[PDB]
């Protein structure tokens, strides 16, 4: 992906505890991932 080419890439502003990274990704819901930050079950882009 370091040299992969894309179209229409946008950044996101969200602050998480850090212990629920797997929870932010779809398939898991938590105290902050359940409500505050949600990702679709088919979500492009990675977690940084």
């Amino acid at each position, epitope marked *: 992906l370091n040299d992969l080419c894309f179209t229409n890439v946008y950044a996101d502003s969200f602050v998480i505890r850090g*212990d*629920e990274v797997r929870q932010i990704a779809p398939g898991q*819901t*938590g*105290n902050i991932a*359940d409500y505050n930050y949600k990702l679709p079950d088919d979500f492009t882009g990675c977690v940084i």
Partner: nanobody
Amino acid sequence: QVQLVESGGGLVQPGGSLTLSCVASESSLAPYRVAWFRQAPGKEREGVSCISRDAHPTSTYYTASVKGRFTMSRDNAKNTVYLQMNSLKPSDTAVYYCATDLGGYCSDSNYPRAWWGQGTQVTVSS
């Protein structure tokens, strides 16, 4: 609208074990957090523990007086939450109540307090 039934309390010796059950009927506790409270006569109701709808250790909360001794678990199929006391102390002798609301996740400071059961008496003595 939900009613709760506490049971399992009784006369136990110091250092003993017990298992309380907070039976929920007419409503489902699966999407809602559940909290445990105890109140011996003389003192105001105090929190014991609070389990969330996900039943996760992160969402699993215990009060200081019960850390490392009291454990809870829930089975939403039967619509009841357990509370397992280990090494019961005489200070734990109180009327244990379970409280729940429409909220789903507990916090270190927020426990459901909407609907309460009749309560069960846990006595830790000879």
